[PDB]
Amino acid sequence: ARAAFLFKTVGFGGLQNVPINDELSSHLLRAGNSPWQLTQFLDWISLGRGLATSALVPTAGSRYYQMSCLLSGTLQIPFRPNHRWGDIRFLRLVWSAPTLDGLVVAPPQVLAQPALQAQADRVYDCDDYPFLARDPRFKHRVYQQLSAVTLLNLTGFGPISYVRVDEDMWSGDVNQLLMNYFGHTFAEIAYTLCQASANRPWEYDGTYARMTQIVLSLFWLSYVGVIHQQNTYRTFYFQCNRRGDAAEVWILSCSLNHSAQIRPGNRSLFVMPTSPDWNMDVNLILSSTLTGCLCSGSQLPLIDNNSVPAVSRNIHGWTGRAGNQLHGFQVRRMVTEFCDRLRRDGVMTQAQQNQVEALADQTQQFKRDKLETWAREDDQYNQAHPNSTMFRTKPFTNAQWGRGNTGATSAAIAALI
Amino acid sequence: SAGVLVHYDKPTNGHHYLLGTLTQMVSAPPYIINATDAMLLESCLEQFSANVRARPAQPVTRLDQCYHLRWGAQYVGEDSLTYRLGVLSLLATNGYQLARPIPRQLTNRWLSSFVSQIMSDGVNETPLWPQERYVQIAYDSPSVVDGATQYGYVRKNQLRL
Amino acid sequence: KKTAQLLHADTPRLVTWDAGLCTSFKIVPIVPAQVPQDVLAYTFFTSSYAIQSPFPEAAVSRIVVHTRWASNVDFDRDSSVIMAPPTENNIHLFKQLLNTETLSVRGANPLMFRANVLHMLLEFVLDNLYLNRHTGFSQDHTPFTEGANLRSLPGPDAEKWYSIMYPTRMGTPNVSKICNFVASCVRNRVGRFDRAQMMNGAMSEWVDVFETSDALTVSIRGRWMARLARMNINPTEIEWALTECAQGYVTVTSPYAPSVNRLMPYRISNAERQISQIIRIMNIGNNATVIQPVLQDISVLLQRISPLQIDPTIISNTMSTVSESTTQTLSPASSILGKLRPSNSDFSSFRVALAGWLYNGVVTTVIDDSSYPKDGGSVTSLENLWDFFILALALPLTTDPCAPVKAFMTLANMMVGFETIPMDNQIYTQSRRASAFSTPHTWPRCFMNIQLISPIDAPILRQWAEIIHRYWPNPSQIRYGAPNVFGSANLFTPPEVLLLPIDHQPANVTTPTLDFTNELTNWRARVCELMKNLVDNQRYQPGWTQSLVSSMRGTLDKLKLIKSMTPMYLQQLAPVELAVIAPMLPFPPFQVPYVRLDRDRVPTMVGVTRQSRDTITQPALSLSTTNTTVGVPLALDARAITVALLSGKYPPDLVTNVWYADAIYPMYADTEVFSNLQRDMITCEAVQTLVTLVAQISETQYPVDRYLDWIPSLRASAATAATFAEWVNTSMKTAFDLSDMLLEPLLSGDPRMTQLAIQYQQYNGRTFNIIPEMPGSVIADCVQLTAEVFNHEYNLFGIARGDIIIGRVQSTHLWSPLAPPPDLVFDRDTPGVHIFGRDCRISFGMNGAAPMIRDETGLMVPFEGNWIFPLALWQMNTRYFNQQFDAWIKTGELRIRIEMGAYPYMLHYYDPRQYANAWNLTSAWLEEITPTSIPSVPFMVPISSDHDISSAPAVQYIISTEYNDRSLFCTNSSSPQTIAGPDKHIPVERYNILTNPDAPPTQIQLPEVVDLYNVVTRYAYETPPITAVVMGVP
Amino acid sequence: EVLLLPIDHQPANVTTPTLDFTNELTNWRARVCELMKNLVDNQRYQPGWTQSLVSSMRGTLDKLKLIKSMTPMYLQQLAPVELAVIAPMLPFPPFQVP
Amino acid sequence: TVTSPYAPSVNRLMPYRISNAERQISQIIRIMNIGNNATVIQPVLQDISVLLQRISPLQIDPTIISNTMSTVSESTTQTLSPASSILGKLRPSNSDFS
């Protein structure tokens, strides 16, 4: 179980403010004035069947980052030491209730008065605000989404996911529930688990918690290439027909060909992508979201201070003195890792590998060009309108395009088995 | 809806919570008392007496006797008896002493007068404020729960008397 | 109507299937092709060999909107948007809303345009809420493709569907425009290219195909599928929820094997149930005739489920236990058997007292006034004694929060002339009727503290007050429901918790035998002892024999010791029955906390809010003023409740587990809750859609983006907003096939400041608020996406943007008026223009002096130059302006720019080789302008030729300020080229997935450009009923 | 050049909110409704009422308090304009004391 | 706005200008003419009210009240109710608003 409820806000990208403005905020709240957007997010990415795109939200990672920016900017009003909610405005917006249900447009007298000036990289505690401390169910319901936001905002790279292997997790009820998900895609399972988590918070060792941990382990082990049709994990695995494409689909399948031998004991790690490609990959974002929704009911091992930037260190329940390190990979090289592991196992030929690599190279070319063009447009806009100063996507640098530690994380995930 | 009480020092049979029923105490001639208010009042009087009678070489069964409110604060208003009794409980635990003798066998009229004083007009001057989160001790308070007890008490270096 | 809506509501139709094409735009041939010409031999064209072509073969082709023109559906939403070609008049689309005062059939009010477009866009969304169905494929037996798999459409005449749906399958023997385009495409992207074959010998779960479609409706149906997928649940979770709901008296099974994919959308969020509950509560307020049948239904079900039955003789026999002599005139037992008066048909009044426990937040159960003494109570009479006894037993069962004071005053009214106690004033005195004491303010101060009652003057009342204060029943709570599927609708209490005024204790034994340790018997014991005290009185006795004092105390001991199973049943079996029944109720429980004697906490008001006031945008500030109170009291019979309390009987041999297992089994086969959940989701969607659509035409407190502010709209008022909201409601109800009420509670008010919240307040001034969170809505987001796309693609919808210039232009050139040269246009910043506004005044000319009109600067100018007009100035002075200016526009050198913003248009084509003049059309348009309406703007456009033609004069009179020709497809689609007139080739950007070989197959280009060839996902999910997969053990 | 009115006037504006207590007439209606809520709230001026009726009176008063009538708006803005337009043309010109 | 074209001349005659004292004298005469006879003043008020009814865009719909309440009585057995009492006293069924 978890005893501390700390979270971290977004940091400025060299700008003078939070990188969100009025236009983007009105775009987010066009169909619902709740800052807790995690359900509406799920309706926009459309189960991951295609490349979602908007004029103001070019990608899925763009919307995820903009939700983070809005929460980080707006939650600083009720968390001031005086703990007042309806007295001032943040970018024409005010809070509806002491219980933070939604946002409305400020009344004229507050519009006349100036706005709150937020700060970068703040760390807050949920127990400080009295209305959160009073109601535990409300605190957990919002802390799920705050945990997801912290997981995005902890470092400069993409979202962080958690992988665990343990034999004693399995039980009768877990088997009974897992059989129902045969033939479903990863996105559908993620949707249903997120809705179930929203309705009722999970026990420490409930059926749903162990279920979602097993699902994450299956997805990541299939993603690396350790587990396939001919080498299963108690007959269960994930299958992709079109590896390397812009919008991959993974399907949960059952097979009786083989069962891989599993060493006893409990093992786990934290993994994350570093290349900007994660902005267009929905499975990784959903994996991080599932970890966030899990984090409310359970307590995860601490992350080492040496794998995180300076400002994000020594957070009470998140980072620690000698915790686990972060395993970072970038997408294009992992496809080569997948193909190599399959070819060594003997289930794949050289020509098939050639075709997969060619398709993945085309995909990476397209993605890199689009992201660079959008970055250029944002720079131009920031120069033209100094009173707006916004960002549509999380910033990145060129050095993030190269590979790094990919082989190490691949080896570690294969060594989890 | 009624509050939930707890002992952190040495609970009788282990960790436990007390939930009050919606009965009342009418024995006091001019005032009506809920069960939770009655428990807080009796315990705080006990701790005040134990503070005043304390001797350095004389051990006591428990170092803290006052109750703590753990749940149900939002149902209690700032003009009420429960909230003020919580403030007084925190004061007594910190080491404060009442400026009036407490008899070794209480009577109804004495309790009536005491409650009337508590509910008398005025404001709270001491810098100690209740929190359901934890029990806060001053920097220089002569208490010694913190060394011997691990759960529920937190000492603040900036909250000083 | 309201109570029928309360009992059961129409189930909306969510899941519907489409087996056609996912497209809503259509290419049509405005002008015929010139195939039998005299430069090219007819053998060139592929039309003479009868090759079916993917596109129309014509000199001009254009794109129009036609929702579901290629679809094949199993349910009809019946909200189609059908558009005629631009060579026809389309004004009827724009004159459907608020054009009820327009006289002409050919005109529409411009200030209503923004209202008509928005509703139109809503319709466009509502017709496209469908799921794409997987039909079947075949492999190509011809070399036209590389063995591709081609899809089959149900219905007649598929041989044209095959040519339409796969443009790239056509051969290329020619150098026409179509052949060049289709030769420029790639050849491996036709047909199916994904397949989720999970089980051998069954339907594949879904497929991904390349086919003709547009990106906009694909996006809409993707969002719809995503919503329905988040709503999904599986049989195992249903089994667990049903097992939890029955507390273990029902077992159902689920299968355990790999099975086909199903779609059972039933899980919703808690906020949706909150909002539905609030809407229903404001729907029911202050009406007893609405809620009484609900309690009647629940009482009947309680009798159906429960083992207890009422046997009146259990009292009668005990009453015959003692004999009284035939030498007396008054008898106690006769009084009991007369005043109790059972007939066993009043059992309902007992059950209705239990159902009321579930609804004390909106309904209050009070004892009818006639149960009290007719002229007041006197302790000397026996009837009045036993009436007090009946009331003192009956009162605790009610939910009326002022029952204790009513009992105390019922006794105090008996002692007038015997004992006295102080009161607060002269109006509410000791002789006041006890029913009058109905509010916390009427509680006397002697009742609070016992020092105000003399122990020497009124010892009986002292004892009665002590008994009431320390021996009244204690409230309790129980657990119920299964929130993992059904969620909960508890507003003020926590979910999963049901509150009771009576303490509950579970049973340890399934074969019970009589026990008196229950709280109800303990109360009756106090009551009988207190009766004995004042009967034994020597002050009461003088008119009575001593044997009568003895016989009174004897009969008080007969009823003290009656074999009553009612009290033990309520303490142990009844709470379980309530917890089992509650989750199946169509109106879920709604409660406020029970308080025993704590007067500082009795609830005094329950209020819902639906709108806000002035300059207040935050609900927490306006809820305290804008709310409306809710609640009614209900009247019960005291004698029925007392008889049921005294005379309860179990069946001779009862084993509780078997009884409840047999009783509860049938009722769990009913699935009305699964319909109620879908009803809740539709209600929330409709509310959010209403808010988003209303925000466009008027100012509101929510933050929403505004794309259509370039369309003229009127100064809306409260009436206009209500009139728009009624149309929104009608469309929403028609699409989802609902015949009962929707959004109508909101519409009895001003819809421009809507909000939903509830509160209740205590006697001491403390108030508690509930403000549900808006869950978001997919219909509103899809409508806003439609608005974003419309912002760029307005031309396909029949709307032109900008202004027009009226002026004579004559030449032989062949440019199009929808894209004129820049030198014919002028604007406000042009040097030499005159700009007019409100105060134009014409002064006539004399003796050959030219007439003049007044500028804004104050200068007066003659009728020749470049003028700028707003439309309203011509509208409000139509006849005068025509008669003054038409001659000078026709022959003179006057050119006028009319600012219109958005307008419809009509196209007229002509043969360029002959003389053409457009004056008649423009004169008709000018003369048909009225103060409140205008007709479609007429344009004259030349036809394109593929070979040499000679030139001829032409006169034009209307041109557009900017490019408005986006609805044009290719011209001369069958000839190698176009020689004269406007020239256009097939738009490459629409087919980017085929023309650009390095693009990913799933790319889209919204909102800028709508693609016309896409990748579509088609499903084959099963939608069975819940009874089919979940089976109970008989 | 002056015409006297017993009510205040404001510039005409068709979009004025219905629930606005800056208008004198709507405010007057609200004050009267709240006073009656005070009158009936405690049931001390109504002995002889056998069963409680406070919730029903409060509900009816709230319904009458928030009603969506345009008449106060019309009397504040358009009626003075109509009177001023008609006045110069009357056969019997106005005769007013203050 | 009103306009009136004309050609220049000096033999035109349009005699209509007078003073304020003459109008005041005529008004005083008209005031004395009434002489407490109500039959003199009844037509003036009646016709002005009908003209106002014609010109004004405001229109009176009593149904707005009946929908706000939304109560129906089953029979005379619903003896006492505030909403029905107020609706019965207000009488929406009558449409004379003179």
Author numbering:
A (entry chain Q): 2 to 418
B (entry chain A): 217 to 377
C (entry chain H): 242 to 1275
D (entry chain I): 737 to 834
E (entry chain I): 492 to 589
Study authors write:
MRV capsids are composed of two concentric protein layers, encapsulating 10 dsRNA segments. The outer layer of MRV consists of the protection protein σ3, membrane penetration protein μ1, and spike protein σ1. The inner layer consists of proteins λ1, σ2, and turret protein λ223.
Inside the particle, reconstructions of virion and core particles clearly show that the layered RNA genome and densities of TEC (at red arrows) are underneath the inner shell, indicating that genome replication from ssRNA to dsRNA has been completed in the core. Thus, RNA genome may facilitate turret attachment. Five λ2 subunits form a pentameric turret at each of the fivefold axes, serving as the mRNA exit channel. The λ2 pentameric turret changes conformation during virus assembly: in the core, the turret is open, with a central channel 75 Å in diameter; in the virion, it closes, sealing off the channel. In the open conformation, the Ig-like domains of λ2 straighten, forming the channel for mRNA capping and export. Unlike the core observed in this study with an open turret, the crystal structure of the MRV core, which was obtained on samples generated from chymotrypsin-digested virions, shows the turret in the same closed conformation as that in the virion. Studies have shown that assembled core particles in the condensates are active in mRNA transcription, but this activity is inhibited after outer layer proteins μ1/σ3 and σ1 are incorporated to form virion particles. Our structural data align with these functional findings: in the core, the open conformation of the turret maximally facilitates mRNA export efficiency, while in the virion, the closed conformation of the turret suppresses transcription, leading to a virion in the quiescent state. Due to the limited number of particles, we were unable to obtain an asymmetric reconstruction of the core with TEC resolved inside.
